[PDB]
Amino acid sequence: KKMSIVLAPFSGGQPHSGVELGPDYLLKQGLQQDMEKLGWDTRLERVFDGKVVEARKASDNGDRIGRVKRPRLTAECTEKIYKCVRRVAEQGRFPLTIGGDHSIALGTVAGVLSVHPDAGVIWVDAHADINTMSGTVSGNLHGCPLSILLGLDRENIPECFSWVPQVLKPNKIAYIGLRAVDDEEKKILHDLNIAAFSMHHVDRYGIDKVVSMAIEAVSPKGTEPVMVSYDVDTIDPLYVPATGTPVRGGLSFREALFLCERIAECGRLVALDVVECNPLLAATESHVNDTISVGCAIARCMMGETLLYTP
Amino acid sequence: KKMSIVLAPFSGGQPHSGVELGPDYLLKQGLQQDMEKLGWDTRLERVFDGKVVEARKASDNGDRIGRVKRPRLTAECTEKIYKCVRRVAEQGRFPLTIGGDHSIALGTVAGVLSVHPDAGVIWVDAHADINTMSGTVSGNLHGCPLSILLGLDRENIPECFSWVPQVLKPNKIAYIGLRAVDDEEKKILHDLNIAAFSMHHVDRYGIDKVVSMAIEAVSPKGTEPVMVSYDVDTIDPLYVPATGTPVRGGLSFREALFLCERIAECGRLVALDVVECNPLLAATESHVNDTISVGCAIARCMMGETLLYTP
Amino acid sequence: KKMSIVLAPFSGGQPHSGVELGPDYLLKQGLQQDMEKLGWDTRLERVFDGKVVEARKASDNGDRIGRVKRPRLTAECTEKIYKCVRRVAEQGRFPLTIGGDHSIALGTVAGVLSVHPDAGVIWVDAHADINTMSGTVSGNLHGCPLSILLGLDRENIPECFSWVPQVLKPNKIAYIGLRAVDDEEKKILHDLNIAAFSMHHVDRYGIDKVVSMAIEAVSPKGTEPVMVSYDVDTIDPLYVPATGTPVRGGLSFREALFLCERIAECGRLVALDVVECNPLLAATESHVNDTISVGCAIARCMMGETLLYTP
Ligand SMILES: N[C@](CCCC[B-](O)(O)O)(CCN1CCCCC1)C(=O)O
Ligand SMILES: N[C@](CCCC[B-](O)(O)O)(CCN1CCCCC1)C(=O)O
Ligand SMILES: N[C@](CCCC[B-](O)(O)O)(CCN1CCCCC1)C(=O)O
Ligand SMILES: [Mn+2]
Ligand SMILES: [Mn+2]
Ligand SMILES: [Mn+2]
Ligand SMILES: [Mn+2]
Ligand SMILES: [Mn+2]
Ligand SMILES: [Mn+2]
């Protein structure tokens, strides 16, 4: 039971600064001691200085390739994450990656699947994050990592993303919590037949059935590794206010943590990202500790914490 | 795919002014463009001037027949709605009626069932709206339209309501969301054996099962038209604050919209009312746009908007 | 249909004053008239003066036996409750006990099971309330009544608790709503195999299935009496803010009352406690009437109030 907490304080996938403080706040709220208390021998992996990066992020408006913003900076930083996560996993440690915006998942998923090629990916998010380079409207790369990982619109992915291994297939991704899917992303999900469980499916079948279906969707042999990339904006703003792209009608706090328990319970979790905590994007101080404490709770539940006796 | 958005800015079924602004606010939030964007060729039907009516409403306290308030004004305005909705439907257009208080449903239901006689009515509401003329305590006619439509307490319905066709039968109404049913209304629902799915049934079976049961209750052949009359106070005040008669423990925003998707999905929706949005009855500005935007969301979902690819 | 509303304004099981005002506030919000209106011939049983007790509570810091705070005062007051509840039940009246903190359940459960020996106990609570004398960390006796009732850690229960009959067995308690169980309590629940339905089980199976399972767990012959001891902190602070030990991710207001309807519906309810309403522990006035009105609603629903026609 060895874990590396990979710190990815990167905000270059979106406009708003603050998300780069997520790793520090999570760690300040006791993430590492929480994981130690659950039996994990942990250590911190620092990949790059968030303040140097943030400095370069906020200064360099010329890093644009079309409507796409900061592809060079994003490609540089997510390659470092990839190399870090790949090493952690090869070393046989659990990589728990804390963001930072969801563009970091370009490095985490590539890293995990390079070591565990038939790993399934469960993407917990209000958004599909699958806009292509030529299709993105905002040009914010945190809404594009899955298009790059799946190799969509290859013609228009810049050379700076040349490092990304082509290891994720469309039948190894399953979404949970979708409710703000762009028209262009709807077409892609449908054409590629990606298992997508929207808030409609949660409302219709309940969270337990949806989680079961998501695990099965990415686990054919029933034996495969599972990776979860967890965007905190899946959870209704009622519970996670301090986040960049909040959308009404999300998972309750209870559903958000129940999902974690069901996945911990299956015993095949091999990596976890917790992304998009933005402590500055809180109106009140009670909202930062609603958000950061939710990040830590996801981690604890994912990593085996239960309401009743387990050991 | 033709639609007439019927504007019914009437507040004479209840004491509080403001509900007559609902149609304007909904339209200001983009209701017509939303419907156009869903493929509907739309047009606005104006039935009467809400300000002239509101003027006459607020002035004339002598329009009372017993405990019943404003029966003359209500009977006049809802006859105009009836004539308008009947024509729209005969013309083969979808009538989407925006209120205004729920007394307008006296005209909408009569209008739809005069053209589609075996249409079922699903009444989405915290209240049963079925108090009779002699039985009403408040005398507010927005809590009475179904008694007039079903012809209850015929002896005490004034001559001014003589225009109402007797087209709705008790086995063609199904309620969803009930939680503030008056003792006199409880007896009626029970005696007439009206399919009533309270918040107890939603809690007990979940919203999907309840919606299925409601559709079936009013669709015996399984082929019949369906009309939905949607009172926004069904939704917990948490989500719809700006409304006249809010009651604790309602549908979540998610359930409120899930219901719409399930009905859109059945493909037999033939008319929709969205009533009781009262923008003045908001404490804050965030609450008016919680309410008005909910009205528009109900419309979009009812009229086919989905979270994932549909077309 | 005879009922005694047993007033137990005791706060000596926990640090915060205010919970001793619960019975007065509940009664001020119309609890007795509510019960009368449901057909019960009621009367108030006063067990002790809450202000004299509160005076002695707040003054005497020397009443400590180890980490345990106020065992003498708690043992005195809960013996009076026991004697009162036992008499009410022998008289064939329904004891509806209003608290006061949950330490009062030491007297209510002992009282009911002394008259109805195979009565099951459903404990509705965020907490297991089963810490032992030597195991308690806070030493607050409201988190210990079930250890004393089950006779755990007999060696370290003081002589002042000598009066407690040993009538409750581990297979006659079922928990609903657990989400803040101490590590020491987890071990006990597991070792004694106590039916415990946590918020995980509610999320996983839904409240209806959980309530069914809880009733069955304590009703083998299917015929047994049922007692419910209802801690208002089971309900998410969203709905019950004014309480001493609030924990995030609780029952919704709807689930909280649905549970009551399901139990009323089974027809074997023989006693009810409603505990831990603390009106002083409210930030705003809207929160006291969120809490006190919830207490009264639990009572009405438990005691037969329904959304639709029943009689
Ligand atoms: N789809 C969006 C949102 C991306 C969210 C990224 B995540 O899940 O890590 O927080 C927004 C698209 N946008 C919608 C409104 C109109 C303009 C485009 C985009 O930027 O592509
Ligand atoms: N039942 C009420 C509420 C009507 C709601 C109309 B809707 O659904 O369009 O908003 C209220 C009855 N009232 C209850 C409290 C005591 C006095 C009578 C009535 O006025 O008849
Ligand atoms: N488990 C607690 C809470 C008791 C709640 C009583 B009830 O259900 O009537 O409101 C708290 C234990 N505490 C947890 C935090 C660390 C210190 C010990 C205790 O005091 O034993
Ligand atoms: Mn994302
Ligand atoms: Mn997102
Ligand atoms: Mn209504
Ligand atoms: Mn209503
Ligand atoms: Mn308790
Ligand atoms: Mn408790």
Side-chain angles (χ1 to χ4, degrees), chain A residues 1-66 68-71 73-311, chain B residues 1-66 68-71 73-311, chain C residues 1-66 68-71 73-311:
Chain A
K1 250 195 178 172
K2 308 198 167 185
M3 170 181 289
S4 297
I5 300 169
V6 182
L7 308 182
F10 183 65
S11 73
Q14 50 89 47
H16 318 305
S17 82
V19 67
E20 74 280 1
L21 316 181
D24 294 329
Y25 281 65
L26 290 157
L27 285 178
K28 251 84 191 301
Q29 277 219 19
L31 183 69
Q32 190 175 8
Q33 297 98 302
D34 288 349
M35 295 301 99
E36 292 281 356
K37 176 161 154 194
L38 288 167
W40 291 89
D41 176 86
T42 71
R43 65 185 185 193
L44 309 186
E45 301 290 338
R46 321 194 161 267
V47 186
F48 49 68
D49 186 84
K51 294 74 167 188
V52 165
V53 169
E54 183 58 31
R56 164 171 25 174
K57 186 244 176 176
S59 63
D60 199 15
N61 294 17
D63 192 0
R64 272 137 70 196
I65 295 174
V68 175
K69 298 160 179 54
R70 295 171 278 273
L73 180 69
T74 303
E76 172 185 335
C77 286
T78 60
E79 189 182 14
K80 290 173 177 185
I81 295 167
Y82 158 65
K83 290 170 180 166
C84 180
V85 170
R86 175 164 189 156
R87 192 169 33 76
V88 170
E90 289 175 340
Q91 291 172 2
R93 304 178 73 86
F94 188 101
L96 199 164
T97 303
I98 59 183
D101 66 62
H102 220 159
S103 69
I104 64 114
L106 181 55
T108 64
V109 175
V112 175
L113 268 64
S114 290
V115 182
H116 294 286
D118 59 337
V121 175
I122 297 165
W123 195 274
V124 185
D125 207 320
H127 307 94
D129 287 358
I130 194 161
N131 273 314
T132 65
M133 301 302 97
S134 33
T136 183
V137 164
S138 71
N140 294 327
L141 284 172
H142 75 158
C144 304
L146 279 170
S147 70
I148 299 171
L149 286 165
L150 287 176
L152 305 193
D153 190 31
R154 197 233 179 274
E155 188 159 54
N156 296 291
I157 303 176
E159 200 275 326
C160 56
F161 285 111
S162 60
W163 66 263
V164 184
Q166 299 303 306
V167 293
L168 186 62
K169 301 295 119 188
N171 70 343
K172 298 298 287 182
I173 302 161
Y175 291 103
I176 299 174
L178 295 178
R179 62 187 182 276
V181 186
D182 299 339
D183 287 338
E184 269 223 27
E185 294 175 305
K186 293 183 187 181
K187 194 54 168 58
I188 290 164
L189 268 62
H190 177 260
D191 292 338
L192 296 176
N193 190 37
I194 289 156
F197 302 97
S198 72
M199 290 307 302
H200 177 85
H201 301 103
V202 180
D203 290 338
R204 193 174 190 143
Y205 304 125
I207 190 67
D208 183 69
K209 185 48 172 154
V210 170
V211 175
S212 291
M213 288 191 290
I215 298 167
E216 292 175 85
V218 305
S219 307
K221 317 309 158 205
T223 87
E224 292 89 338
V226 183
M227 175 176 182
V228 178
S229 194
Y230 204 136
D231 190 333
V232 296
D233 70 21
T234 315
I235 305 173
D236 188 272
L238 254 57
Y239 311 94
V240 170
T243 199
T245 50
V247 195
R248 205 182 185 175
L251 299 179
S252 57
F253 168 96
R254 286 167 47 182
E255 289 168 323
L257 294 185
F258 175 83
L259 176 160
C260 300
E261 295 170 346
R262 269 301 309 287
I263 296 172
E265 174 180 287
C266 96
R268 288 183 285 129
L269 184 71
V270 72
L272 170 68
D273 316 333
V274 181
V275 304
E276 297 281 354
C277 287
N278 190 335
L280 309 187
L281 249 55
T284 62
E285 70 301 299
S286 173
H287 293 166
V288 319
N289 302 306
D290 281 335
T291 308
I292 296 303
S293 59
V294 162
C296 292
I298 288 163
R300 291 191 306 269
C301 290
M302 275 297 188
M303 300 318 297
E305 186 191 79
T306 63
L307 296 180
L308 294 177
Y309 188 64
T310 280
Chain B
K1 250 195 178 172
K2 308 198 167 185
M3 170 181 289
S4 297
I5 300 169
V6 182
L7 308 182
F10 183 65
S11 73
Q14 50 89 47
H16 318 305
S17 82
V19 67
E20 74 280 1
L21 316 181
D24 294 329
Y25 281 65
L26 290 157
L27 285 178
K28 251 84 191 301
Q29 277 219 19
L31 183 69
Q32 190 175 8
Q33 297 98 302
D34 288 349
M35 295 301 99
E36 292 281 356
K37 176 161 154 194
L38 288 167
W40 291 89
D41 176 86
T42 71
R43 65 185 185 193
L44 309 186
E45 301 290 338
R46 321 195 161 267
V47 186
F48 49 68
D49 186 84
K51 294 74 167 188
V52 165
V53 169
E54 183 58 31
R56 164 171 25 174
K57 186 244 176 176
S59 63
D60 199 15
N61 294 17
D63 192 0
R64 272 137 70 196
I65 295 174
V68 175
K69 298 160 179 54
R70 295 171 278 273
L73 180 69
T74 303
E76 172 185 335
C77 286
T78 60
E79 189 182 14
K80 290 173 177 185
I81 295 167
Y82 158 65
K83 290 170 180 166
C84 180
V85 170
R86 175 164 189 156
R87 192 169 33 76
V88 170
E90 289 175 340
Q91 291 172 2
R93 304 178 73 86
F94 188 101
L96 199 164
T97 303
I98 59 183
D101 66 62
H102 220 159
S103 69
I104 64 114
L106 181 55
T108 64
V109 175
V112 175
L113 268 64
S114 290
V115 182
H116 294 286
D118 59 337
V121 175
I122 297 165
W123 195 274
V124 185
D125 207 320
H127 307 94
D129 287 358
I130 194 161
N131 273 314
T132 65
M133 301 302 97
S134 33
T136 183
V137 164
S138 71
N140 294 327
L141 284 172
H142 75 158
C144 304
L146 279 170
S147 70
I148 299 171
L149 286 165
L150 287 176
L152 305 193
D153 190 31
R154 197 233 179 274
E155 188 159 54
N156 296 291
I157 303 176
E159 200 275 326
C160 56
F161 285 111
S162 60
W163 66 263
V164 184
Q166 299 303 306
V167 293
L168 186 62
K169 301 295 119 188
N171 70 343
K172 298 298 287 182
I173 302 161
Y175 291 103
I176 299 174
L178 295 178
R179 62 187 182 276
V181 186
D182 299 339
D183 287 338
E184 269 223 27
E185 294 175 305
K186 293 183 187 181
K187 194 54 168 58
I188 290 164
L189 268 62
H190 177 260
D191 292 338
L192 296 176
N193 190 37
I194 289 156
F197 302 97
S198 72
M199 290 307 302
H200 177 85
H201 301 103
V202 180
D203 290 338
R204 193 174 190 143
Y205 304 125
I207 190 67
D208 183 69
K209 185 48 172 154
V210 170
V211 175
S212 291
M213 288 191 290
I215 298 167
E216 292 175 85
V218 305
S219 307
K221 317 309 158 205
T223 87
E224 292 89 338
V226 183
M227 175 176 182
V228 178
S229 194
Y230 204 136
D231 190 333
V232 296
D233 70 21
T234 315
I235 305 173
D236 188 272
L238 254 57
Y239 311 94
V240 170
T243 199
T245 50
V247 195
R248 205 182 185 175
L251 299 179
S252 57
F253 168 96
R254 286 167 47 182
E255 289 168 323
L257 294 185
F258 175 83
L259 176 160
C260 300
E261 295 170 346
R262 269 301 309 287
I263 296 172
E265 174 180 287
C266 96
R268 288 183 285 129
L269 184 71
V270 72
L272 170 68
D273 316 333
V274 181
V275 304
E276 297 281 354
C277 287
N278 190 335
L280 309 187
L281 249 55
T284 62
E285 70 301 299
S286 173
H287 293 166
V288 319
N289 302 306
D290 281 335
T291 308
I292 296 303
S293 59
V294 162
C296 292
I298 288 163
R300 291 191 306 269
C301 290
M302 275 297 188
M303 300 318 297
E305 186 191 79
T306 63
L307 296 180
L308 294 177
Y309 188 64
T310 280
Chain C
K1 250 195 178 172
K2 308 198 167 185
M3 170 181 289
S4 297
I5 300 169
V6 182
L7 308 182
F10 183 65
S11 73
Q14 50 89 47
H16 318 305
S17 82
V19 67
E20 74 280 1
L21 316 181
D24 294 329
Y25 281 65
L26 290 157
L27 285 178
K28 251 84 191 301
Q29 277 219 19
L31 183 69
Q32 190 175 8
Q33 297 98 302
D34 288 349
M35 295 301 99
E36 292 281 356
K37 176 161 154 194
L38 288 167
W40 291 89
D41 176 86
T42 71
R43 65 185 185 193
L44 309 186
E45 301 290 338
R46 321 195 161 267
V47 186
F48 49 68
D49 186 84
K51 294 74 167 188
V52 165
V53 169
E54 183 58 31
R56 164 171 25 174
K57 186 244 176 176
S59 63
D60 199 15
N61 294 17
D63 192 0
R64 272 137 70 196
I65 295 174
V68 175
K69 298 160 179 54
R70 295 171 278 273
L73 180 69
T74 303
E76 172 185 335
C77 286
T78 60
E79 189 182 14
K80 290 173 177 185
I81 295 167
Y82 158 65
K83 290 170 180 166
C84 180
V85 170
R86 175 164 189 156
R87 192 169 33 76
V88 170
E90 289 175 340
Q91 291 172 2
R93 304 178 73 86
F94 188 101
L96 199 164
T97 303
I98 59 183
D101 66 62
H102 220 159
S103 69
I104 64 114
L106 181 55
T108 64
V109 175
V112 175
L113 268 64
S114 290
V115 182
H116 294 286
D118 59 337
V121 175
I122 297 165
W123 195 274
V124 185
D125 207 320
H127 307 94
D129 287 358
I130 194 161
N131 273 314
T132 65
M133 301 302 97
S134 33
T136 183
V137 164
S138 71
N140 294 327
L141 284 172
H142 75 158
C144 304
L146 279 170
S147 70
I148 299 171
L149 286 165
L150 287 176
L152 305 193
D153 190 31
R154 197 233 179 274
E155 188 159 54
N156 296 291
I157 303 176
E159 200 275 326
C160 56
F161 285 111
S162 60
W163 66 263
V164 184
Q166 299 303 306
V167 293
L168 186 62
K169 301 295 119 188
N171 70 343
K172 298 298 287 182
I173 302 161
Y175 291 103
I176 299 174
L178 295 178
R179 62 187 182 276
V181 186
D182 299 339
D183 287 338
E184 269 223 27
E185 294 175 305
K186 293 183 187 181
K187 194 54 168 58
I188 290 164
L189 268 62
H190 177 260
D191 292 338
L192 296 176
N193 190 37
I194 289 156
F197 302 97
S198 72
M199 290 307 302
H200 177 85
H201 301 103
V202 180
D203 290 338
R204 193 174 190 143
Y205 304 125
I207 190 67
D208 183 69
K209 185 48 172 154
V210 170
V211 175
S212 291
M213 288 191 290
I215 298 167
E216 292 175 85
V218 305
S219 307
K221 317 309 158 205
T223 87
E224 292 89 338
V226 183
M227 175 176 182
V228 178
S229 194
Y230 204 136
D231 190 333
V232 296
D233 70 21
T234 315
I235 305 173
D236 188 272
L238 254 57
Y239 311 94
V240 170
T243 199
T245 50
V247 195
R248 205 182 185 175
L251 299 179
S252 57
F253 168 96
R254 286 167 47 182
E255 289 168 323
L257 294 185
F258 175 83
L259 176 160
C260 300
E261 295 170 346
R262 269 301 309 287
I263 296 172
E265 174 180 287
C266 96
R268 288 183 285 129
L269 184 71
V270 72
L272 170 68
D273 316 333
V274 181
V275 304
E276 297 281 354
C277 287
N278 190 335
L280 309 187
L281 249 55
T284 62
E285 70 301 299
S286 173
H287 293 166
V288 319
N289 302 306
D290 281 335
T291 308
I292 296 303
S293 59
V294 162
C296 292
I298 288 163
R300 291 191 306 269
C301 290
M302 275 297 188
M303 300 318 297
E305 186 191 79
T306 63
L307 296 180
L308 294 177
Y309 188 64
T310 280

